[PDB]
Nucleic acid binder design. Structure first.
Ligand code: ZN
Ligand code: ZN
Ligand code: ZN
Length: 85
DNA sequence: CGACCGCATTGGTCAAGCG
DNA sequence: GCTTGACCAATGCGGTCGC
């Protein structure tokens, strides 16, 4: 009840197995409300949420896409990939 | 051009810690 | 049992530099 049905890795914390398993089945239920980011770990999505704005720092929003960033240096990454026009 | 180099972000991993 | 976050390496970029 603790081993991966797909490759047989053995987990002593079974919750680790339920997350690992999605590496095979591709399920990504933790979906960001701010972008199309998704992941198989609740931990990761909250960590990714920092990238959308810190509490004490000035936030940067996409002028086209209303999307908020905390660091400018990844906004234009979103400009190039999503706003080529 | 190609190969280095700093950074913001990430995927994988793990297990303390809970009460 | 289950959540949470630290850790690490990988990534990808943008830029730099190289008998
Ligand atoms: Zn597996
Ligand atoms: Zn997001
Ligand atoms: Zn945008």
């Amino acid at each position: 009840s603790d081993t991966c049905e797909y490759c047989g890795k053995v987990f002593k914390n079974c919750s680790n197995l339920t997350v690992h398993r999605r590496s095979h089945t591709g399920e990504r239920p933790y979906k960001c409300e701010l972008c199309n980011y998704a992941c198989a770990q609740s931990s990761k999505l909250t960590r990714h949420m920092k990238t959308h704005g810190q509490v004490g720092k000035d936030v940067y929003k996409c002028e086209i896409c209303k999307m908020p960033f905390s660091v400018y240096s990844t906004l234009e990454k979103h400009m190039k990939k999503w706003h080529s026009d």
